[PDB]
Curated annotation (Swiss-Prot), chain B:
Source organism (scientific name): Homo sapiens
Disease implicated: Kohlschuetter-Toenz syndrome: An autosomal recessive disorder characterized by severe global developmental delay, early-onset intractable seizures, spasticity, and amelogenesis imperfecta affecting both primary and secondary teeth and causing yellow or brown discoloration of the teeth. Although the phenotype is consistent, there is variability. Intellectual disability is related to the severity of seizures, and the disorder can thus be considered an epileptic encephalopathy. Some infants show normal development until seizure onset, whereas others are delayed from birth.
Subunit and partners: Monomer.
Domain of life assignment: Eukaryota
Protein name (record): Protein rogdi homolog
This protein's encoding gene: ROGDI
Tissue specificity field: Widely expressed with highest levels in spinal cord, brain, heart and bone marrow. Also expressed in fetal brain and liver.
Covered range of the whole protein: 56 to 95 of 287
Family to which this protein belongs: Belongs to the rogdi family.
Places the protein is found: Nucleus envelope; Presynapse; Cell projection, Axon; Perikaryon
Swiss-Prot record, chains C, D, E:
Tissue specificity remark: Widely expressed with highest levels in spinal cord, brain, heart and bone marrow. Also expressed in fetal brain and liver.
Matches recorded under PANTHER family: LEUCINE ZIPPER CONTAINING TRANSCRIPTION FACTOR LZF1 (PTHR13618), PROTEIN ROGDI HOMOLOG (PTHR13618:SF1)
Annotated source species: Homo sapiens (Human)
Keywords: Acetylation, Amelogenesis imperfecta, Cell projection, Cytoplasmic vesicle, Epilepsy, Nucleus, Synapse
Residues modified as N-acetylalanine: 2
Descriptive protein name: Protein rogdi homolog
GO BP term, example: positive regulation of cell population proliferation
Length: 254, 40, 255, 255, 255, 47, 47, 254
């Protein structure tokens, strides 16, 4: 009988419709929450502690946003170093991370919140984009492995210290996930690659061949970096949850 | 047995015909008729 | 309410299933009919008339199945000459052999399937139909006049050897054109110091000499069983097409 | 230099856009023309001549639209018999009804679209064209002689019942063949102790008896408005094809 | 045992390779033949007969290549009138120009390929074949009567201007139909206070006046070189199809 | 020569077949092991 | 010169012909291989 | 106007071309660097420390390449063990890892460095292959979870000790990412699965049923394994960077 069946397409279609409105509200709830969290994460990168103290080398670094404004270092080999003028060394990891955050936030705020829910693949694409930006920010914050000793030497940071420093020392400052890191490489050229960063690593610099004889590493937690990372993790999980619910929905009615 | 003599061209369709003897890498003979310049 | 939706969904599922059985029975009905028609078409190619009389050039040809068993030809010249085969020899017409092969293949396609399976989407039926139709259309096409036969190919044909033995101012070709046995005589002319035209004034090379077609004489005669076969092909093609179309309508209807 | 490349890219983008508008106008022009032609074709199927005279068997048939309102037949035997319908009865020719349906569908395809949207790739136009062309070709095909009509189907047809009432040594079939109303009389012969051939010497079963076609008489007459309709179909098909081809040229040109 | 399987696999690989070379030679043979036939077909369109005599309306037309250099027409009315071109003027028949273009493109497709590459799958050959066949079929189609030519388009044609200069109760159209040069005269009738039919009783608007076709006179004459060209097209199409089919058989055989 | 080649498709096909039976046994071995381990994991959650 | 003019080139292989010869050989090769394989398969069933 | 537009296709095409040459040079730079790093990683596996000392069990193991040439173990239950003859127990993890390294290096050296850059999908495929080999090497170096106690018993290592040892002891030596690991399982058969490796795990061996009563684990860092792992990480990051740059490029001009 056809009347039964028409009634029937009607009731099934009504249930599925109502459920799409539910999923619609859920999607936008999650999206708004993502903008809130990510904007706070953004606020952590712009301007909160600025002076940081980082056991045989110790140092006091003033870090303003992405700019390492001052770095006063004591080394037991006691010798003492500082910046010249009032110059700032920019930590590119923070800049990059801030860029990814900016992009994620754009992805969230440049979208029509009058979506009238469609299928979900569009939401899924949005989620993928945002998650890629977050994971990239976090990855950048992490210690870069592919930095060679000659790249460290060619870095402006070596040029940056007062008094002007020796060619048996290299200084590198970087961010590892969430803690300001200061590393001093003690070298001495040998008599008549570059990747290991460990004692006994060899490489060329200028026109001379040098070997790392030992390495000194100190570090200190940066509270707002930690807050930012926590925000990234939470945002990633929210995104994943939304993706999973959308998949369950779409597989359920298909 | 391995072929040594090869026929290149026809009498009616072409205006060149040839029987070339190819031994290994050596063209030992190339016996050629050219129906030129007039077609008789 | 979920009970409504479930009982309901059961109602649509029942209707669709019943229609699937209807389509099943229709499919097998049409297939059986195809085997009948095509087997009759097949029976037409093997043993019905054998002697045929074919304008201003005349001929009596005895054709048994695919074999032109004899060909007696009179040509009326400006002067008449009379020709026949070696008495003992038969010239086979390849078109009929080819067509019979395609028919055989179609029938195999129909009889080598289990007529007892439950109905499915139809894409499989569609592929079967395509295969059969391809075989039928190929049979018909082969029966048709082959355009790509060159005059030198006609000369190199055994038929020329098959005749009293005759000069190289004459070429004889016997072929099939759909529903007509065809006899054509090419009257030639060696030229003083391509090949595709088949019309008066066409030029080509043969042997080691250059020749031109001077005149063309064409006679033909209807072959009744070929006509029956062709009619069968047409009808089968339409049956196949109808089944394909109905299957498409069904599949689009419930999707 | 980036300024050059940008201004430049703007120049190509402008040309392509303008051409897209040209193609837009062309598409809608052709579509409008199609509606005109097809509506005239439609008007041909409903009300122009109604009485038709159809060799050695003669007939006067009154045909109104799709309905064969009357059929008066004289058959000249070796002896003449004369037949007519129940006076009150009409036999409908299904081919015309079918064709009219396809025409109706084509016209719907053309009139149920907004003639006001901005131009796109064309694949959508291509699908519209395919749909319309399918409807036209189907109309034409239906108008053509159906091959798959069996003699028992002819016997089981209401037309036999429709005549004074006549014996089972005669079968009468009236159908359409493209541009010709066709009347065929099958003269039969019961056999002493398939069905597709339609030729003299064809055998089949009917009722509970086995019968053979003894002779076949075929007469026909041109139906002017059917001819007009067919001409319209051909022209429409060509218009559609031309639009498809131009769209393809455009799309390949700018890709 | 692995030695058996390896030597073995080498044996199949060798057979397949050798067959690939056979197919290579076949492909290039067919291609060369296509260039020959198509170049002859091309030669037919440029310079063979030029004067043609075309029922109850008669005409002597001088046609040079694609150009109708002169058209002398006599119309026998109920009363005869006689017409000719400006003596100095030529009317070009677009169908021939179009066809010649398609032929040119096909020949380019054949001659702009390196006849020296090693054999592959064939899909590339298949694409070449499709391209060539499309060009041939288009040439043939263009040579055929265009259905989509309206009476107002005929009136707006330069041909009307080309004649002594004549009234608006007469329209003259000259076109090509496959193998026949065609002359048609439309005798008109202004109506008292679409356009596609081309039959007596067809109505249309022209200028600022409304007109009806009163009578139609159609004469035609075979153009020998057009016939040769068409024969060439048919043969080439069959050669292409045969190559496609053989390639498909090969590819399915070894997969 | 075709006989060589037929022998040849036969030996290759036999080797591949035997290897599929090997992979068959491996698959089910692993699956059974998975049921054992996972049922124990299940038993940790109930009491 | 007379030898050159006289020399008739080898005619090109017919594809259909070659495929048919190949197919014949394949049919019989495969039949034989099937007999071998199946006879040993049978031998697996014997003491 | 068409002249403007032709000029225009020309300038765009020139810019895109020059950028493909840039990407060409970048790709090969990275590839060469990968061969250098990976060949050094390879050199770590062939022949550097050989003797290693691994708090209630202690042991001295001599490890040469992939071969554990000697293992002298003291157990407090004090009892003492050693190898017989001059035989070596091969640690398959190292062999496997070395194989993956060999394959990666082949992937890099068996390619045409006259590439004339095409699209990048080919580079991407190469990158995927190499990265798969590296990640597999690293994964193999890691502690295998799926080793059962009966598999440990069926291992030749148990047979390998002098004096010939008791059936209340099982000895297993393996590599966990970068540190030589020695584990002693103390059993005792019960009165009238196998996966947990923890105290209270039960399993069958020979024809008897046994239970692990406790487990002793000692380990020691292998410096060259650490170097190799560092190399793997750096190589993976270099590959990832190249993949990402190629993607940016290809999406940029498409």
């Amino acid at each position: 009988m056809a009347t039964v069946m028409a009634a029937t397409a009607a009731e099934r279609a009504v249930l599925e419709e109502e459920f799409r409105w539910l999923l619609h509200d859920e999607v936008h709830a999650v999206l708004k929450q993502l903008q809130d969290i990510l904007k706070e994460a953004s606020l952590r990168f712009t301007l909160k502690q600025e002076n940081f103290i980082l056991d045989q080398v110790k140092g006091v670094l003033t870090l303003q946003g992405d700019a390492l404004s001052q770095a006063d270092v004591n080394l037991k080999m006691l010798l003492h170093f500082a910046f010249r003028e009032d110059k700032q060394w920019k930590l590119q990891q923070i800049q990059d991370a801030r860029n990814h955050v900016s992009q994620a936030i754009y992805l969230l705020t440049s979208r029509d919140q009058s979506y009238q829910f469609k299928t979900g693949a569009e939401v899924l694409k949005l989620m993928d984009a945002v998650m890629l930006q977050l994971t990239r920010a976090r990855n950048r914050l992490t210690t870069p492995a592919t930095l060679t000793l000659p790249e460290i030497a060619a870095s402006g940071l070596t040029r940056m210290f007062a008094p002007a420093l020796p060619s048996d020392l290299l200084v590198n400052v970087y961010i590892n996930l969430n803690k300001l890191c200061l590393t001093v490489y003690q070298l001495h050229a040998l008599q008549p690659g570059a990747v290991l960063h460990s004692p006994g690593a060899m490489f060329e610099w200028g026109s001379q061949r040098l070997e790392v004889s030992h390495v000194h590493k100190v570090e200190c937690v940066i509270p707002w970096l930690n807050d930012a990372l926590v925000y990234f993790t939470v945002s990633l999980q929210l995104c994943q949850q939304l993706k999973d619910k959308i998949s369950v929905f779409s597989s359920y009615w298909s | 047995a391995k072929q040594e003599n090869f026929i290149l061209g026809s009498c009616g369709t072409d205006q060149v015909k040839g029987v070339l003897t190819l031994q290994g890498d050596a063209l030992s003979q190339a016996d050629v008729n050219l129906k030129m310049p007039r077609n008789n």
